[PDB]
Amino acid sequence: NKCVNFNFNGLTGTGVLTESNKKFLPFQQFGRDIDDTTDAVRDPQTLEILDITPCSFGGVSVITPGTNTSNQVAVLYQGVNCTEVPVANVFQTRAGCLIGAEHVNNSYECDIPIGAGICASYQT
Amino acid sequence: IANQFNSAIGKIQDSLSSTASALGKLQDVVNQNAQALNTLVKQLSSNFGAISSVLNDILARLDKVEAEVQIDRLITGRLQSLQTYVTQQLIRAAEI
Amino acid sequence: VSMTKTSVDCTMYICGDSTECSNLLLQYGSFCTQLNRALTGIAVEQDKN
């Protein structure tokens, strides 16, 4: 339940390890998906199956009014759940997580597009 | 005119719910994008004529002045694999 | 009307967590940014479509 560099039996990778509900056959050591990428592993000492999640990543995108108008900016961590951002105002979206933008209940017309129905603007 | 229209709408409803292939032009676009993403990830298993396809297993066997030459192969072959995907995506995106 | 927006971090594709491969890939110059400009240009035009 933390991001770590793992090395089980030379199968080096980096991700979040967590308990799997998969059961391997007694002899199988690694688990792969349709992409032929390792997504599960059985620990070689305490024989149990661990799911590997690729630990979180995404584009930073900066939302701004024009330079002349203002300097203030809001930041989008695309595809990131912001339980992971402070490690480096807040509002989670399906597009990723905004910081510095204020969330409002009123539906204005879309000025700067963000994603998943969300847009941003500069306002009082 | 109403009874003909109300029947024709009923035939659309049944047809879409009955046959597999009617959504073909959309399912094809989902399948081409899945196939291209799958192909792009599979290219990471390819050696490109280097000693290995696993970057850490190159670094764990050769010293730096020649481990760089193997890593340069994988960089060249993987960069060629992204360029093939992005060219496919651009040409497709022009179709869409 | 559209297709799935996709995006790549070129460094995680080519060089996933190897700083050596990352410092070698840097020799090739703008190639990864040119790929991201291309893919983000496909991504925005899905909304335009």
Partner: peptide, 24 residues
């Protein structure tokens, strides 16, 4: 129509949700 990965690959959501496309 029958329809975040390891190697730097991601999918991004559309600016309009399938609710907003339904509403238009």
């Amino acid at each position: 129509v029958t329809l975040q990965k390891f190697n730097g690959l991601t999918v991004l959501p559309p600016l309009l949700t399938d609710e907003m496309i339904a509403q238009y």
